[PDB]
Write a protein that binds this ligand. Structure first.
Ligand SMILES: C=CC[C@@H]1/C=C(\C)C[C@H](C)C[C@H](OC)[C@H]2O[C@@](O)(C(=O)C(=O)N3CCCC[C@H]3C(=O)O[C@H](/C(C)=C/[C@@H]3CC[C@@H](O)[C@H](OC)C3)[C@H](C)[C@@H](O)CC1=O)[C@H](C)C[C@@H]2OC
Length: 108
């Protein structure tokens, strides 16, 4: 049903990213078969972006807002909350479900 949050280790229960917030977030991205396509942890570098304003995939906009600082989780994004029917040429096959193991490090 779109984006689903599989909770692994809990956040602080208080600080949740809101629309327009900057988040600092480690992620490991895998395709529906288990193969990694991207990883901020292999670059030793958490990613930073603005949540809820249309700049990341829908699964992150509707999914990262459900986490609190410190939390580990998996966002399971079906293709309509990711790269859709065409996919991402070279990287993401069409209609793919994507699986992001994420850790929310900080909100601003
Ligand atoms: C000049 C632009 C390059 C610029 C690249 C960076 C800043 C480096 C940054 C680590 C991205 C990665 O570079 C290693 C690499 O990350 C992926 O592997 C990936 O894990 C992914 O899915 N992520 C990254 C983590 C957040 C969720 C999602 C994303 O939303 O990413 C965003 C994304 C592509 C959203 C599109 C935007 C267009 C909409 O139409 C579409 O809507 C469906 C969704 C990224 C951050 C963009 O906002 C900014 C950029 O693209 C992509 C598979 C391909 C992407 O490289 C291109």
């Amino acid at each position: 049903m779109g984006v689903t949050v599989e909770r692994i280790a809990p956040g602080d229960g208080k600080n949740f990213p809101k629309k327009g917030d900057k988040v600092t977030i480690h992620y490991v991205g895998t395709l529906e078969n288990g193969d990694k396509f991207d990883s901020s942890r292999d670059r030793g570098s958490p990613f930073q972006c603005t949540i809820g304003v249309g700049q990341v995939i829908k699964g992150w906009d509707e999914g990262v807002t459900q986490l609190s600082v410190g939390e580990k989780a998996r966002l399971i994004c079906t293709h309509d909350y990711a790269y859709g029917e065409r996919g991402y040429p070279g990287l993401i096959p069409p209609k793919a479900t994507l699986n992001f193991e994420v850790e929310l490090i900080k909100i601003n």
